[PDB]
Amino acid sequence: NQRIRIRLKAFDHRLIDQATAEIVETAKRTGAQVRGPIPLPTRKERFTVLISPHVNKDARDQYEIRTHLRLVDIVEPTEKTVDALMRLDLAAGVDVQISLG
Amino acid sequence: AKQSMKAREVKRVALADKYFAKRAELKAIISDVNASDEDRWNAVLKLQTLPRDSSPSRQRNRCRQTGRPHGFLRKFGLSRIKVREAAMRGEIPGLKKASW
Amino acid sequence: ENQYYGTGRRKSSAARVFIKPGNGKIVINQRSLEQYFGRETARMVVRQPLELVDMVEKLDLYITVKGGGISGQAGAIRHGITRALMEYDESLRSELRKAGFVTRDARQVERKKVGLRKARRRPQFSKR
Amino acid sequence: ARIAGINIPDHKHAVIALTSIYGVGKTRSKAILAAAGIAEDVKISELSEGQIDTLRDEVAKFVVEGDLRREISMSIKRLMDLGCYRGLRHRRGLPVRGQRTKTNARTRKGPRKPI
Amino acid sequence: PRRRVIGQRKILPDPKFGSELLAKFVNILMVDGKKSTAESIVYSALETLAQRSGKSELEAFEVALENVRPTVEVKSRRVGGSTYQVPVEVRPVRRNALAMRWIVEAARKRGDKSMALRLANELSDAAENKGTAVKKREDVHRMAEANKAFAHY
Amino acid sequence: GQKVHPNGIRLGIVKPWNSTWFANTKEFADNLDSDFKVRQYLTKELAKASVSRIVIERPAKSIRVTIHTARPGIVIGKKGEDVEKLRKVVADIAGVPAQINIAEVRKPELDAKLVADSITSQLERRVMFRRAMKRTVQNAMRLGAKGIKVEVSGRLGGAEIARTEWYREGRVPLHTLRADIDYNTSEAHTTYGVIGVKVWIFKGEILGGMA
Amino acid sequence: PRSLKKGPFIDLHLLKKVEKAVESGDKKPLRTWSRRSTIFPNMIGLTIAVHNGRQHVPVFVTDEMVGHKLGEFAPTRTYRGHA
RNA sequence: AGAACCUUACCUGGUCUUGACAUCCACGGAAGUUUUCAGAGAUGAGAAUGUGCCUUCGGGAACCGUGAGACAGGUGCUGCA
RNA sequence: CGGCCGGGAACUCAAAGGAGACUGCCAGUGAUAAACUGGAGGAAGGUGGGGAUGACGUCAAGUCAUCAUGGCCCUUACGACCAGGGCUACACACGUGCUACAAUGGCGCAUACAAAGAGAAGCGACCUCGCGAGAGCAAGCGGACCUCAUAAAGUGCGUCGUAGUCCGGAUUGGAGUCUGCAACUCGACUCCAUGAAGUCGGAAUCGCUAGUAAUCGUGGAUCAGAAUGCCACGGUGAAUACG
Ligand SMILES: [Mg+2]
Ligand SMILES: [Mg+2]
Ligand SMILES: [Mg+2]
Ligand SMILES: [Mg+2]
Ligand SMILES: [Mg+2]
Ligand SMILES: [Mg+2]
Ligand SMILES: [Mg+2]
Ligand SMILES: [Mg+2]
Ligand SMILES: [Mg+2]
Ligand SMILES: [Mg+2]
Ligand SMILES: [Mg+2]
Ligand SMILES: [Mg+2]
Ligand SMILES: [Mg+2]
Ligand SMILES: [Mg+2]
Ligand SMILES: [Mg+2]
Ligand SMILES: [Mg+2]
Ligand SMILES: [Mg+2]
Ligand SMILES: [Mg+2]
Ligand SMILES: [Mg+2]
Ligand SMILES: [Mg+2]
Ligand SMILES: [Mg+2]
Ligand SMILES: [Mg+2]
Ligand SMILES: [Mg+2]
Ligand SMILES: [Mg+2]
Ligand SMILES: [Mg+2]
Ligand SMILES: [Mg+2]
Ligand SMILES: [Mg+2]
Ligand SMILES: [Mg+2]
Ligand SMILES: [Mg+2]
Ligand SMILES: [Mg+2]
Ligand SMILES: [Mg+2]
Ligand SMILES: [Mg+2]
């Protein structure tokens, strides 16, 4: 059976690692073998905006939206493991994309 | 900006989506390499007949909360001032003052 | 043998140095030192640590480097060789420290700052 | 040393020496030399007249000198007589390709004259 | 500065001869951080200078520096309402720095075809005391001896 | 001079975001626009319900709005009717289905937004600015604020020339990032223009952070 | 310049006006606001009043004008000197 | 943090007046889609295609047009309210 | 003969959590002090480097044209729609940048080393055609995977030999490509041809204390197309501080 990969994306480090811990621990408990987590490189957008409504070109604010990525690979899935994963709900605002094979 | 300007933007978007297919096909036949020259001429004439505002290059992005025609940011859809306001109020998720 | 290993970093460069006793061969990134460093200053900088320990011709060092440029990679290699030699003996500490090769130069490019055309250069000021 | 009336320098590598001709740039000079079959580096010295005559044929292919000057002047005259905007700009001695005129147009306006 | 706390920037000896004087000379000749080309020019100039002179590989350089080294210079000073020119003795580090700077200037202000040739000819002329840098040193010393009367202030 | 927004500088350190969801570039702006519309509607509809904070989360293809208010009974209505109508119209605004939760703020006098709203309402309802701001600090310190500062500004009492005045009790360290400083603002539209009121409330420091 | 593969541009309204006028031999100046249309050989001899933004200026189309734009024969800025 | 048109706030000329943009009221038609002509376009004349959804079958909702009003609209002045 | 593929979690790296640096130790100075200088050890030594952070207040500073608002003013018009023009003019002055004035260089050939980012009405590979801008077909990629995307300066070899030049690229004519309803006023880029001024710049004046100045390339926002500006990334990398 092909392994199932779970890519978790979030704007928070602690929240994404909490969800990842939940997933990996569940997988270990339900008799699955899991090769994770892998901390993939985190994107960091940047934005620079004038804070002065008129002129004052040198007054600026730089902001950032850091996007964290975690990869959990579950090799050799079982129906029991998959059902446990299904019935486990993850913290909101954390995106999860599942690639299959 | 003026309510009339914002309404004008809405009208332009409406027309642009309305004539998308015709604009695309007419442009295709106009620029087709192996096309009848007479057909290409007819297609050019039809494209000229089509409404000006239908063109998707005649619409300008404007701040979705005020309408400011300058300083737009596609990521948020707002201008600099409103972006700063929302960022401080913590309504834009993830946005934070950063230093490196 | 023991393949005494040392990592070295300079500017934005990273070099992994493996030391093994034998001849005095230096292969960098599957290339020779002469081919890799057309700059004789860089070649001398890579030679420096082996000369001070005086164990140059008796050690074969393989080095793999990434990042930075000529001088950054040369410095990373030198620092890695210092650490690997330390791994090899640990007696050399006094000599290499007194030479100054053990320290990891922390100098880095400063970030471009708002209002300044460069890291510290400011736009020309007209009085009137 | 004589190509369409010009005294090609006899001490400069051929292609660069051939660049002297009004109408033969470096690209056309290379093209002419390659078509004739002469090395670019060899100067006019050590070039027999026969090679010079082959170069004369190759140069004769291109429109160079008085004829080219004539073509350029006649094109400008055509624009001016036609009465177009470009003609008006060529008649007022101001930038004709849409460069700014409020300042930094001295190349066309000529050296500055005070008020 | 105001705090009067300055730490000298340690330099590294030149790779070929191991002379900090040569390293400083290379730095002074450098432009736009092109150390590779400045070091190449300095090495070539030293080679041709050694051949021309007929001496060791660093002693000609030392002779030229000895001949262009200034002992004293003038500092503008305002002591008693008068704009005095006080001749001050310069410390040896500044002596060497000024000597090298003048040599590089004189070389850059020559007519020869290449920088290595200009530097070699300038070093030879300085060694024989007939060049621009040595003329500048003599002018400075003459100016100082002229106003020796204001040595205190 | 000009000072950084306290909540803005402290976001991610000791303060949570009001909006907490993930979205790719294809829908980030749409989510922000829907958020703005929903918050505007809810704030106006609940202007008289003492709403302190509207937290919008976007679980999957749904939107959960949590309204922090000091008057839960008014917002809820008899057996949930008012919550139901608010949800039914928030679902319209958002497009996706909506759910509404209500969080009571136990001690409103320690809430910056509620304090600012009270002061603004009093000013519009014709009260002495000094009396109003002094009364809010006293109440805040009574309820136990580690520190509080109120700043009223602009044509106080109908004066022709606008002036700024501010009271401050306790300690309000605005340069200490680990400090918990709940800051908010309000504008009073009175017969002689807009009067701005800024309120800082310092309620202790946070060492572990916990973001 | 406009790409060769697309052809020379002309506005349909001007095309139709010139076609009708040339076929019927009319000599009334064609009052047009299209300064972007290209002068085609079929228009030679006709008088076209191209708008400069204030008033239409008559231009007698001629053989030498083929290929140019109509707008290139209607200066829009009046410059008569500073001093 | 980016004027060919659009932006656009300026000028010429052509146009509209409860209005480009809203809430309310009444009447009449689902909207919508396809083509012809006049005009620079804005709009005007038309023509085919058009009977959507709840429907307590009383009719409603959305949508469009018409008509009168309250009102809309103002990038118009005062940053010395 | 490519980490490519079996294979290994060693190493670079990728994040997340922690340790570490505090005049802590030694010697000297100093008032039995604060504090300062030097040394050891250490990756770093005295705020290790850089940034965010801007007290009470001054300038009735700037913004009624982002927005909100009091008072005023218009209501078949100072409101609204459309096409063309203008914001791009040009005798002149001031400010900010780019390019050079050459040989520490120009041109030609071969060759090496980065970092940080962006991408779905998007980035667009390979192959074919075009001198070139690009075109046709079209893989892959919501991306440590695919593309943008060959970094340049450097190094090696040749030539140029101090010229207004094989420096300089302005201007200008012809012919083109792309975006776009449409490049005349008024785009960008390509090719061919022309090769202005300029040979280091008065009084005066600006920036900068180290990975800084200087020099060389790269990316992004805005954007159908349109940076020598703005914001970021790295490569090479100094002089001086007596006072
Ligand atoms: Mg990415
Ligand atoms: Mg408005
Ligand atoms: Mg646009
Ligand atoms: Mg030490
Ligand atoms: Mg221009
Ligand atoms: Mg500030
Ligand atoms: Mg315009
Ligand atoms: Mg009018
Ligand atoms: Mg003011
Ligand atoms: Mg104000
Ligand atoms: Mg004022
Ligand atoms: Mg006034
Ligand atoms: Mg120490
Ligand atoms: Mg501080
Ligand atoms: Mg008005
Ligand atoms: Mg217009
Ligand atoms: Mg302008
Ligand atoms: Mg420059
Ligand atoms: Mg050369
Ligand atoms: Mg060049
Ligand atoms: Mg590139
Ligand atoms: Mg080279
Ligand atoms: Mg050249
Ligand atoms: Mg050329
Ligand atoms: Mg001259
Ligand atoms: Mg010269
Ligand atoms: Mg210079
Ligand atoms: Mg300093
Ligand atoms: Mg640059
Ligand atoms: Mg971009
Ligand atoms: Mg662009
Ligand atoms: Mg840099």
Side-chain angles (χ1 to χ4, degrees):
Chain A
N1 192 333
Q2 56 278 351
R3 77 274 176 276
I4 47 178
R5 307 174 164 260
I6 304 178
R7 308 185 66 245
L8 305 173
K9 306 179 185 297
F11 293 150
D12 189 7
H13 64 318
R14 50 179 79 245
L15 188 62
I16 203 178
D17 191 27
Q18 168 258 24
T20 297
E22 288 212 16
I23 286 318
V24 59
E25 217 308 304
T26 292
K28 296 194 306 174
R29 167 203 57 103
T30 180
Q33 33 186 120
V34 42
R35 323 210 75 265
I38 288 84
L40 293 180
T42 78
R43 185 178 178 182
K44 27 193 179 184
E45 274 97 316
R46 288 193 194 93
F47 304 92
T48 307
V49 293
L50 268 226
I51 59 188
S52 59
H54 198 253
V55 205
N56 304 127
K57 181 73 153 176
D58 295 359
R60 299 195 153 100
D61 264 3
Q62 298 188 293
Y63 302 140
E64 166 165 316
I65 322 181
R66 221 171 293 186
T67 294
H68 313 289
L69 265 60
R70 303 285 185 270
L71 176 70
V72 175
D73 284 2
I74 299 180
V75 190
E76 301 192 7
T78 313
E79 273 286 348
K80 170 167 58 66
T81 75
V82 296
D83 298 0
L85 296 180
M86 288 165 165
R87 269 88 252 184
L88 171 56
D89 170 67
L90 248 48
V94 178
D95 169 63
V96 39
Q97 197 281 311
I98 303 179
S99 70
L100 294 73
Chain B
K2 289 176 287 172
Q3 303 284 349
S4 55
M5 218 66 58
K6 302 189 281 184
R8 215 183 302 177
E9 291 289 350
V10 186
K11 167 185 58 184
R12 290 190 175 95
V13 176
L15 265 68
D17 67 68
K18 197 165 85 64
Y19 297 98
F20 189 16
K22 288 201 55 58
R23 169 70 94 268
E25 51 91 4
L26 289 186
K27 197 173 309 304
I29 167 68
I30 283 171
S31 61
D32 189 66
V33 178
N34 298 114
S36 172
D37 199 1
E38 193 267 356
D39 299 4
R40 286 154 59 150
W41 184 263
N42 299 1
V44 171
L45 294 184
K46 293 178 54 60
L47 201 73
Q48 183 270 357
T49 61
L50 288 190
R52 264 194 168 104
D53 276 4
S54 66
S55 180
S57 63
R58 280 182 44 91
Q59 50 192 356
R60 185 181 191 84
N61 303 8
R62 287 179 180 258
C63 177
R64 298 175 73 113
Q65 287 173 187
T66 59
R68 186 178 175 83
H70 277 298
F72 185 84
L73 283 169
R74 298 181 179 193
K75 175 80 169 184
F76 318 103
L78 301 175
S79 64
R80 43 186 192 80
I81 313 168
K82 289 305 165 182
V83 158
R84 182 187 185 273
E85 296 171 20
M88 297 314 187
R89 291 183 302 256
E91 306 165 352
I92 304 178
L95 208 59
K96 57 181 177 185
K97 191 176 307 305
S99 301
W100 52 97
Chain C
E1 193 245 3
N2 293 313
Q3 208 69 242
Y4 301 92
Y5 171 74
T7 304
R9 287 174 279 249
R10 175 82 185 93
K11 288 298 291 298
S12 63
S13 297
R16 35 194 294 177
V17 185
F18 291 95
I19 302 279
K20 187 165 60 268
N23 305 320
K25 187 188 64 178
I26 308 178
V27 35
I28 307 177
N29 292 66
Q30 276 82 196
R31 291 193 274 167
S32 178
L33 178 62
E34 288 73 7
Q35 317 165 186
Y36 202 90
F37 287 148
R39 183 183 295 258
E40 193 61 37
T41 306
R43 281 190 283 255
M44 196 279 300
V45 172
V46 174
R47 299 289 181 77
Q48 285 180 13
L50 301 171
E51 298 166 353
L52 179 65
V53 65
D54 209 355
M55 288 200 61
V56 39
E57 42 96 348
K58 31 246 128 171
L59 289 170
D60 298 299
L61 35 156
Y62 176 73
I63 304 98
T64 284
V65 204
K66 291 178 307 181
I70 304 292
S71 299
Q73 290 188 225
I77 293 179
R78 188 181 79 170
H79 184 266
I81 297 172
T82 304
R83 286 190 162 178
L85 293 173
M86 288 334 295
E87 187 93 349
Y88 175 74
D89 202 324
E90 282 106 10
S91 177
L92 331 156
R93 260 271 169 73
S94 307
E95 293 78 354
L96 281 178
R97 174 150 288 281
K98 194 184 56 53
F101 297 173
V102 57
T103 85
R104 197 283 196 190
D105 190 7
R107 294 188 288 173
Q108 249 176 35
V109 289
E110 303 181 3
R111 60 158 297 183
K112 208 277 203 188
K113 302 168 187 58
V114 176
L116 324 178
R117 305 192 314 124
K118 225 156 81 179
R120 291 168 193 241
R121 202 262 191 273
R122 303 183 63 253
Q124 183 173 2
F125 173 82
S126 176
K127 302 193 66 178
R128 321 163 194 85
Chain D
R2 197 76 182 280
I3 303 290
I6 325 169
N7 289 4
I8 286 194
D10 291 351
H11 67 272
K12 291 167 59 180
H13 295 270
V15 50
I16 296 99
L18 202 71
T19 311
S20 174
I21 307 172
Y22 185 100
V24 180
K26 206 57 175 297
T27 101
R28 263 183 179 182
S29 189
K30 284 180 176 62
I32 288 170
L33 290 193
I38 284 82
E40 271 68 15
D41 289 5
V42 55
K43 35 214 62 185
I44 303 307
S45 66
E46 306 131 358
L47 287 183
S48 60
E49 262 290 351
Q51 306 164 282
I52 311 299
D53 282 62
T54 65
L55 267 62
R56 285 190 176 96
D57 162 66
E58 316 291 351
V59 170
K61 180 201 301 305
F62 298 143
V63 172
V64 287
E65 289 304 301
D67 41 57
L68 181 63
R69 309 189 181 95
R70 176 174 321 161
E71 275 189 336
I72 293 167
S73 65
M74 286 312 177
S75 61
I76 296 181
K77 188 81 194 317
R78 188 187 69 87
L79 286 175
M80 186 178 306
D81 285 354
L82 194 49
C84 61
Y85 175 84
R86 304 181 56 194
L88 303 172
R89 297 235 145 265
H90 275 280
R91 199 165 321 125
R92 310 313 126 80
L94 295 179
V96 80
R97 292 196 179 180
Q99 298 83 355
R100 73 151 54 191
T101 328
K102 185 171 191 172
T103 174
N104 304 4
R106 294 261 65 96
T107 173
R108 274 295 294 244
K109 291 182 185 173
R112 183 180 288 97
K113 45 172 173 49
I115 297 180
Chain E
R2 231 91 184 200
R3 314 312 288 246
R4 309 168 67 178
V5 181
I6 296 306
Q8 172 74 9
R9 275 175 174 84
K10 184 193 62 59
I11 71 176
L12 293 177
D14 73 306
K16 180 167 164 54
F17 297 92
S19 33
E20 273 75 2
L21 290 313
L22 206 158
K24 179 65 63 176
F25 200 48
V26 166
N27 288 8
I28 292 185
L29 194 137
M30 187 183 321
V31 55
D32 305 329
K34 295 234 188 184
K35 181 172 281 186
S36 58
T37 320
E39 179 196 359
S40 316
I41 293 175
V42 170
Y43 284 167
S44 184
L46 274 198
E47 194 72 285
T48 167
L49 180 73
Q51 273 308 91
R52 176 185 276 114
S53 199
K55 276 188 300 302
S56 180
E57 296 75 3
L58 180 83
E59 317 291 358
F61 181 64
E62 188 56 29
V63 166
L65 294 189
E66 280 172 324
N67 279 18
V68 196
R69 266 169 197 179
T71 298
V72 60
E73 74 171 328
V74 33
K75 292 293 293 180
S76 59
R77 183 68 75 155
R78 301 216 48 251
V79 182
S82 326
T83 54
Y84 288 152
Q85 303 278 87
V86 47
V88 306
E89 54 155 9
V90 284
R91 51 198 194 276
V93 201
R94 177 166 172 79
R95 297 167 182 249
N96 271 304
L98 291 181
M100 297 184 184
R101 188 185 301 164
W102 294 349
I103 290 297
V104 180
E105 296 158 358
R108 290 197 180 113
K109 295 175 60 60
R110 209 170 253 263
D112 305 326
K113 290 192 180 302
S114 182
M115 188 59 185
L117 178 64
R118 289 166 229 181
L119 195 57
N121 292 331
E122 194 57 44
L123 286 177
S124 60
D125 278 323
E128 72 174 8
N129 314 39
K130 297 178 188 58
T132 329
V134 65
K135 187 70 219 67
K136 176 178 303 175
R137 182 263 278 184
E138 313 292 14
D139 286 338
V140 168
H141 278 152
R142 186 176 298 101
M143 176 174 302
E145 186 269 349
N147 309 278
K148 184 170 63 68
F150 288 129
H152 234 284
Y153 290 164
Chain F
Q2 290 76 6
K3 318 173 201 304
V4 69
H5 197 272
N7 189 19
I9 182 58
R10 288 168 175 82
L11 275 177
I13 305 176
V14 301
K15 296 286 190 186
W17 276 271
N18 281 306
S19 181
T20 46
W21 39 258
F22 179 85
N24 280 314
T25 169
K26 313 174 70 60
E27 66 281 351
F28 202 82
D30 310 65
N31 291 6
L32 287 178
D33 183 60
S34 63
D35 288 0
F36 171 83
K37 290 185 180 299
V38 166
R39 277 188 231 255
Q40 171 186 1
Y41 168 82
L42 288 179
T43 306
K44 183 256 307 181
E45 188 93 24
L46 308 178
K48 288 297 182 178
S50 178
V51 39
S52 167
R53 176 189 175 113
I54 302 185
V55 177
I56 301 190
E57 300 172 311
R58 308 184 83 89
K61 315 303 178 182
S62 63
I63 167 177
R64 293 196 289 107
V65 174
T66 300
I67 301 172
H68 295 61
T69 175
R71 243 64 68 97
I74 299 180
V75 186
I76 292 183
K78 283 294 302 172
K79 313 170 184 178
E81 46 173 319
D82 207 45
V83 184
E84 148 62 45
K85 60 154 68 175
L86 287 175
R87 181 223 66 96
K88 181 103 78 181
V89 57
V90 167
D92 178 18
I93 301 174
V96 303
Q99 180 166 335
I100 296 193
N101 298 330
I102 294 301
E104 179 180 9
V105 279
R106 257 39 183 259
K107 286 172 288 183
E109 278 105 331
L110 302 179
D111 188 299
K113 183 57 180 176
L114 300 180
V115 168
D117 294 359
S118 64
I119 302 179
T120 280
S121 177
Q122 290 168 131
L123 293 183
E124 289 184 357
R125 294 178 292 105
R126 295 178 42 82
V127 83
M128 315 295 298
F129 69 98
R130 193 138 297 171
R131 278 181 54 111
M133 60 180 173
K134 193 58 169 182
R135 171 163 49 190
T136 212
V137 169
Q138 300 316 290
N139 296 311
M141 297 302 288
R142 166 212 61 189
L143 280 205
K146 313 294 297 182
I148 188 261
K149 174 169 56 176
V150 289
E151 166 181 317
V152 190
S153 167
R155 297 199 64 170
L156 311 185
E160 207 75 14
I161 43 185
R163 55 181 198 258
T164 69
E165 272 101 324
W166 58 272
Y167 275 50
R168 175 173 55 85
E169 289 193 4
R171 65 185 314 267
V172 192
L174 288 109
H175 283 59
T176 296
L177 278 68
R178 70 189 168 194
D180 187 2
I181 310 257
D182 189 50
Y183 162 79
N184 215 318
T185 172
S186 186
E187 298 185 356
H189 305 273
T190 187
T191 165
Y192 303 110
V194 183
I195 304 193
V197 182
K198 302 179 180 179
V199 179
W200 305 256
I201 299 180
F202 173 55
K203 41 192 57 172
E205 283 194 358
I206 323 292
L207 300 181
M210 205 182 64
Chain G
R2 193 169 191 261
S3 304
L4 296 174
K5 75 173 183 303
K6 304 174 68 60
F9 165 80
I10 183 190
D11 281 306
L12 182 54
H13 49 86
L14 181 65
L15 181 62
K16 294 295 188 61
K17 289 288 186 299
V18 159
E19 187 58 41
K20 272 63 173 184
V22 71
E23 75 89 6
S24 70
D26 182 49
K27 285 309 296 287
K28 310 310 297 304
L30 296 200
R31 191 172 70 109
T32 190
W33 295 257
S34 173
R35 316 181 69 252
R36 58 188 187 174
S37 52
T38 307
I39 299 174
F40 286 158
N42 65 315
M43 321 178 192
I44 299 310
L46 300 178
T47 160
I48 307 181
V50 44
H51 197 210
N52 70 350
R54 191 165 37 179
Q55 63 270 346
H56 296 264
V57 46
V59 291
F60 195 100
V61 185
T62 198
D63 178 286
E64 208 72 24
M65 295 185 185
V66 183
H68 292 206
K69 295 305 197 75
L70 280 185
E72 212 209 2
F73 298 89
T76 62
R77 297 202 200 80
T78 146
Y79 172 65
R80 285 166 306 202
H82 302 266

